[PDB]
Design a protein around this nucleic acid. Sequence first.
DNA 1: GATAATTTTCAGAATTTTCAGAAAATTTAG
DNA 2: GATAATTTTCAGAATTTTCAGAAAATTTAG
Lengths: 256, 256, 256, 256
Amino acid sequence: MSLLSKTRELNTLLQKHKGIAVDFKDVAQTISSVTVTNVFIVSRRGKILGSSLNELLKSQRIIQMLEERHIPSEYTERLMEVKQTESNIDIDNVLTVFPPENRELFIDSRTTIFPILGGGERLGTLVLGRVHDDFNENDLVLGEYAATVIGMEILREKHSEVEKEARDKAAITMAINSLSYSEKEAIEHIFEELGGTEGLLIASKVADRVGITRSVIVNALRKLESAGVIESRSLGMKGTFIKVKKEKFLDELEKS
Amino acid sequence: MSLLSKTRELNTLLQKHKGIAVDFKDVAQTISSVTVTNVFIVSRRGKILGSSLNELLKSQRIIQMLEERHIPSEYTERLMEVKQTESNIDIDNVLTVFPPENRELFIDSRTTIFPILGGGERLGTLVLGRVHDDFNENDLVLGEYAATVIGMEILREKHSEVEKEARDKAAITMAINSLSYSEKEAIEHIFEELGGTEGLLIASKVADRVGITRSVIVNALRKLESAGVIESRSLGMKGTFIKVKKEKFLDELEKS
Amino acid sequence: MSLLSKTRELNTLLQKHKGIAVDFKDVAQTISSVTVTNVFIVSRRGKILGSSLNELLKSQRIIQMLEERHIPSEYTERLMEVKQTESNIDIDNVLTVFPPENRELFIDSRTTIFPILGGGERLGTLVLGRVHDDFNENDLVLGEYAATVIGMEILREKHSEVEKEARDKAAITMAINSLSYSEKEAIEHIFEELGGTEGLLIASKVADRVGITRSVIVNALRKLESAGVIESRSLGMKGTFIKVKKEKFLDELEKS
Amino acid sequence: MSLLSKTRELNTLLQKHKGIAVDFKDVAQTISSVTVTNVFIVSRRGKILGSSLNELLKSQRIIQMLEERHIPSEYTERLMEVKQTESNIDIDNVLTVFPPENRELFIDSRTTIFPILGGGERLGTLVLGRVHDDFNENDLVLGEYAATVIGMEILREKHSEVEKEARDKAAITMAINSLSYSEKEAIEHIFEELGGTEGLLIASKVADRVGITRSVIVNALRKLESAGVIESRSLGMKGTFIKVKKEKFLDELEKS
DNA sequence: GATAATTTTCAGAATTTTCAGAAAATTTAG
DNA sequence: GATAATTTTCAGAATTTTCAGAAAATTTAG
Ligand SMILES: Nc1nc2c(ncn2[C@@H]2O[C@H](COP(=O)(O)OP(=O)(O)OP(=O)(O)O)[C@@H](O)[C@H]2O)c(=O)[nH]1
Ligand SMILES: Nc1nc2c(ncn2[C@@H]2O[C@H](COP(=O)(O)OP(=O)(O)OP(=O)(O)O)[C@@H](O)[C@H]2O)c(=O)[nH]1
Ligand SMILES: Nc1nc2c(ncn2[C@@H]2O[C@H](COP(=O)(O)OP(=O)(O)OP(=O)(O)O)[C@@H](O)[C@H]2O)c(=O)[nH]1
Ligand SMILES: Nc1nc2c(ncn2[C@@H]2O[C@H](COP(=O)(O)OP(=O)(O)OP(=O)(O)O)[C@@H](O)[C@H]2O)c(=O)[nH]1
Ligand SMILES: CC[C@H](C)[C@H](N)C(=O)O
Ligand SMILES: CC[C@H](C)[C@H](N)C(=O)O
Ligand SMILES: CC[C@H](C)[C@H](N)C(=O)O
Ligand SMILES: CC[C@H](C)[C@H](N)C(=O)O
């Protein structure tokens, strides 16, 4: 099986995965097939995001490591020292992925470490190990496709979660500014009587006890409703039902 | 220059690009440098998302294509019928990326087509062109790997686009439900006289033409600001400035 | 000389330094006196912030390192691996501060590495080396006073520069919001004709060419003057003299 | 517990505190834990910046001191006369930190005084108290090193305080120069009727009492907002809300 | 000393704005 | 079907606000 067929095999997993997310465990399996290696996709903090082992599964430490979803904290930082792709690493090296204890079974073992880069920084590490054979250039080509692609699926993940928080801050800010002076004070006193995420209270009485017009309170709520900060429904004599959908709202209110 | 050298060059563009969006015009010329080819990155409908050419620029048609940001209609169809990679296409084949009229300069021209796939569907096509040298398998490895990542960035963009159009619909609806009856009527008329995405008008004047209280207009606008549907700016004696941040708002409002 | 007298010596340098800043070179000298060692105060990126060497000055690499204001980039990252105070490190170790080349002169050499911590993260490293003798606990007490104190003078420096940028953003924002719609457009057209940091222009003519009232322009400038964004003086027939004192102002204006 | 163990404990509080400001109440009890002492951190004028006591809390006077956040006037003087560290002070010496009346519980009490020095001047005093055990030299090493860092955090705070009062003066002056003659007159009267740091008043009413155009008042307030001297809030029919962010503004204005 | 050129100041109207409160509309329980 | 309890809607006045522009004030050159 030629390199083209191996690259074609890997590139097919990505071109046909439904959705946008790519399962790194699926990737780990594919990387093992076309190269016959034990695969480890670890984070910058060592969290195991993918794995496709066989010979290593035969070690006690490795089993307890897969359950921890982590790797030796000390060995995690040593992978950070590899800034370029270092291949063909024997068992007599510190960067070997195989247990130095069971050296007899892994005497001819060779280890290669690919760094995962994205957006201009370090994102993870892709460690591949073999029991005897060595790594050639055709293997480093396949491994660098993975690191470059994994870093892209991580760069998207980190970026998408930043966009989410950035929108919530805008939604809260977009709402806090649309409030009037009397409407900010109204919202402060309501969330006080409400106490929790959702509840039921009589807005009118809260308006009378505090000395704020009743329509000023209805006005503030409808603005927060428009901004997606809360959901509200009327219950007539029972009162007004409120369900906060953005918790950080109040915290940013007094801050204003 | 070995394949592992060309591969490392391409991956470097992707791992260090700032932000998240990868510019296809950068990819195209990067693909062109490492393979010594004329590069086209086109969509299903033949829009040139990115290109980096040299010899082809000595043809009249190629220039007007770049001006139109599109490729011929006839050619776009025949690219869709290419369901797999097809390399070393001669000048006399319809799938050739070189103008046949300039045969004196393109008689020994070879052109390979790489379908761009993402999420299991055809997103576009990556076309490479050479004047003399044929395409080896080490070239198909790059072109196929570049079409893969190109499909990944398109898959991602189309997803973020859909998420945004959905967040917008939600913003409009959430803001329309916040409007009372008289408030919902003012906005219909305010946005009628505005005539465009943004403008300046005298609200109190429009309030008297229809017979709605001016206070109604002020509160309604302030509720659309809470949902990020419009930006509003008071110019006192000169009127009110209104910039709409959601095209489809007015259309959606009329539905109700 | 007892430890109390050594601690008293060090604590005097800090209690009597005039001003708020503490010169790390002065510190380097004091740390060398009370312990008789070659002192290195390096950053997280290896930048030498202080030094008090003697025996090492006798090496060619060290001389070229002091001029670079840096240390071997590779050795800089290895110091990051020391998370706790590691002392009594022989020349046969990678973390030795002495040149492994001139091993014969530094055979009994012992090296100690103190990490500089502040605010909850790593800030630098304090490396001490000896030619023969070893380190005791009384030496680690003195070295940890230094690391803890150096980290405090660095935490203050980093914090003070953050407070400075945070105020400039507020000054610009505090000003951009106080501007009216017509006053923002006025400031946009003035900085256009101005071209550079400071210059001379006739505001009236700029007002007439663009179609904005002349007093609207005087009003915008006086607000920016109040916010410290610009300095302005009148020159009657010659025009108005403007000197921008905050460059990022305009960049944040169109962004609004 | 060795000195190097006690030292490492204190440094840990300083290296991991969040922000920049170190809370002296944390330092005091930390000093108390590692040396088994009653701790007082007082200024020149005897204000208890921080304390952590146990046995002393069984005395009436000590409690009222904590309530007053001050120490006796007579005792504060005698601490200033202590120009150097003085350890193992008996119960019958005026420099004792223990109430003589409770002699039955404090007859074998020992108390050491550590002057707190920063920038070459006396900033405060660190006082430690014990019921039985005397103070060794390993204790003077901690108390002297704690007084040093305490002096460092006071030196820093007093500097940031002065920089702020200077930035304020600049903000006031810069804002006053931005005011015209009629504008400068309105603010004098507006701030006269306000009577306090913040309040609500009817500007247009105050405009007619004096005979100034209402527009003048609006623009003047908007110029003080640009310099961060006040916050202003429009309440329409109810009036204008004004919060002053710079106490000394009104005073400084009257000077002109 | 005075003209000429901008630059500021000041005054005033039109519009925008926030709040009050009475009438309308709703929900819940009967 | 109807009372009672809040909840919304709507209308209206008082105040705040932004802009225009004419008169005043300033600087520069003579
Ligand atoms: N698409 C995709 N992304 C993944 C997968 N596994 C992990 N990630 C992403 O990888 C990113 C980093 O991994 P973390 O969950 O943060 O693990 P960690 O222990 O916190 O390590 P650090 O990210 O370095 O802090 C996360 O934001 C995930 O979105 C996966 O299987 N598929
Ligand atoms: N990252 C990135 N995406 C791009 C670039 N140019 C185009 N795209 C994406 O390519 C996709 C198609 O480009 P369009 O310009 O919309 O072309 P089209 O005619 O709509 O193409 P069809 O998808 O066939 O309908 C969209 O998802 C774009 O976001 C580029 O330079 N960078
Ligand atoms: N008080 C004081 N601070 C210093 C001294 N030398 C350096 N610093 C501070 O140490 C901080 C970090 O050093 P840098 O100038 O940033 O050196 P660098 O090469 O950029 O290394 P990094 O800070 O890790 O990025 C700076 O912000 C300085 O303010 C000194 O002699 N006295
Ligand atoms: N970091 C820090 N500084 C503090 C703390 N308590 C007081 N200070 C500083 O200690 C100094 C004096 O405290 P004050 O409360 O002003 O006492 P004082 O009576 O003015 O003292 P004198 O300086 O003698 O006039 C000031 O610079 C304060 O900022 C604290 O808990 N943490
Ligand atoms: C997978 C980690 C490997 C075994 C590494 N050599 C260690 O001992 O931690
Ligand atoms: C890019 C278009 C190519 C050259 C096509 N064969 C044509 O003749 O138009
Ligand atoms: C000061 C650096 C020392 C000599 C280190 N062992 C190196 O060789 O880089
Ligand atoms: C803290 C004050 C001490 C106890 C002082 N000697 C007194 O008697 O008041």
